[PDB]
Amino acid sequence: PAFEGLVQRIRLIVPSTLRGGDGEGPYSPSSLPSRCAFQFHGHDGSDESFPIEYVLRLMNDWAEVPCNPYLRIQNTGVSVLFQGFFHRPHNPGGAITPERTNVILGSTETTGLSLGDLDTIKGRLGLDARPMMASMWISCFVRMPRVQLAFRFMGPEDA
Amino acid sequence: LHERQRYRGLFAALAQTPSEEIAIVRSLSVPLVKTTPVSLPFCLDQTVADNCLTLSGMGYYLGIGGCCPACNAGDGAATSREALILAFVQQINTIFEHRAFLASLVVLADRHNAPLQDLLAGILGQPELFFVHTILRGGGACDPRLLFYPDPTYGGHMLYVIFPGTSAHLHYRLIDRMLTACPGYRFVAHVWQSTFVLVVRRNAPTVSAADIYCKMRDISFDGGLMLEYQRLYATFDEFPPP
Ligand SMILES: [Cl-]
Ligand SMILES: [Cl-]
Ligand code: NA
Ligand code: NI
Ligand SMILES: [Zn+2]
Numbered sequence: 416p417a418f419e420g421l422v423q424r425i426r427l428i429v430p431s432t433l434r435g436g437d438g439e440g441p442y443s444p445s446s447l448p449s450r451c452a453f454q455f456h457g458h459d460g461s462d463e464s465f466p467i468e469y470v471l472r473l474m475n476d477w478a479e480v481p482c483n484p485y486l487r488i489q490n491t492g493v494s495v496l497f498q499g500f501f502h503r504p505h506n507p508g509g510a511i512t513p514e515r516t517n518v519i520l521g522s523t524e525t526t527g528l529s530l531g532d533l534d535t536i537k538g539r540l541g542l543d544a545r546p547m548m549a550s551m552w553i554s555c556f557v558r559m560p561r562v563q564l565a566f567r568f569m570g571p572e573d574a
Numbered sequence: 575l576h577e578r579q580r581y582r583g584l585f586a587a588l589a590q591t592p593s594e595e596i597a598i599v600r601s602l603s604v605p606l607v608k609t610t611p612v613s614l615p616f617c618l619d620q621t622v623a624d625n626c627l628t629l630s631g632m633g634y635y636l637g638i639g640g641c642c643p644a645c646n647a648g649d650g651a652a653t654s655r656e657a658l659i660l661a662f663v664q665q666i667n668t669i670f671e672h673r674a675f676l677a678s679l680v681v682l683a684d685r686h687n688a689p690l691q692d693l694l695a696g697i698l699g700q701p702e703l704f705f706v707h708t709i710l711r712g713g714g715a716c717d718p719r720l721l722f723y724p725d726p727t728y729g730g731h732m733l734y735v736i737f738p739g740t741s742a743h744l745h746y747r748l749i750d751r752m753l754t755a756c757p758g759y760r761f762v763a764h765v766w767q768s769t770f771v772l773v774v775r776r777n778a779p780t781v782s783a784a785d786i787y788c789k790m791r792d793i794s795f796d797g798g799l800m801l802e803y804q805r806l807y808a809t810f811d812e813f814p815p816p
Binding site: 462472473476483484514519530531540545546558564565571573 | 575576577578580581582584585589592595596598599601602603604605606607610611619620621622623624625636638754
């Protein structure tokens with residue numbers, strides 16, 4: 416019953432345009448699966464942002480056992496696919512750095528990022544480490560046969 | 575681990591009130607890193623739909639279109655595919671508008687002793703070049719120079735877009751439109767002999783060249799633009815394409 420609440424929360428965070436929710440089983444905060452926790456996808460022509468940091472942090476918060484949450488982004492050929500993991504899969508560590516926020520994916524192509532690498536990059540940058548003062552989003556422009564990704568740290572407006 | 579300690583509390587507080595969480599999530603609208611440096615040669619395919627490109631004495635860097643003062647100030651005529659094709663077909667009627675395009679062909683044809691009509695007919699076979707010229711033209715007050723060089727790999731020609739001055743700024747809309755309108759072409763930004771340049775090469779509506787050729791003959795170009803193209807072709811003959 417807990418995992419439903421988690422994925423419901425995450426679903427609330429992710430925009431409605433990106434279709435998804437719970438991904439492709441049942442698990443406790445004690446035991447984490449290798450299979451993806453949640454799945455979201457966007458059709459051709461869409462411009463959608465994904466709150467990657469917030470979601471990964473939510474997953475890491477939910478788990479009672481140490482783990483390094485991982486978001487996997489794929490260009491399937493017909494859409495963009497965001498999949499959530501508690502542990503990155505074997506054989507996609509991250510091609511993103513403070514010097515390169517852009518990643519362009521051809522058909523059947525995968526990229527991804529972990530919360531540890533995300534925190535490392537955020538640390539490399541002189542951005543605010545305090546909660547909600549800096550949260551990374553993935554700017555996604557779906558233009559088949561390609562998908563454009565921009566991993567950008569966004570800040571509050573407080574206005 | 576992974577800064578779980580500092581977020582644990584806030585997440586716990588937000589679990590009780592989901593609406594507040596939604597508002598907080600939506601609040602993060604302004605990007606902290608406005609610009610990101612790039613190295614020449616730089617391929618445009620590595621940009622994202624809202625990225626702008628700046629090449630100056632202060633360096634090379636990509637920008638986020640929404641935050642770019644030059645992009646907001648610029649806010650740049652119609653660039654529809656149909657509009658571009660319309661310009662390409664009505665090229666003979668607006669021959670004055672495309673002096674930068676055609677005069678280049680004249681100078682090129684003179685430089686290597688060769689029939690202008692054949693070169694014209696060959697290049698009219700590659701409408702994407704005229705597309706790039708039209709897009710970059712904007713309304714006309716800003717006009718980049720244009721050079722054409724033989725393509726060893728695919729035959730035909732590749733385009734050198736010559737930017738005036740020591741600074742260049744490519745609007746996001748312009749880059750997006752350039753890339754989308756010419757899918758069979760790759761664009762690479764570079765610099766040569768103190769001149770920033772945009773090279774358009776082949777990666778992988780019919781017009782009569784004769785009528786155009788006769789009109790060009792009937793029309794006398796500015797003079798000095800011609801000399802400018804002589805100087806430019808003289809400069810870029812040794813320039814190695816990326
Ligand atoms: Cl479906
Ligand atoms: Cl799009
Ligand atoms: Na663009
Ligand atoms: Ni679908
Ligand atoms: Zn700009």
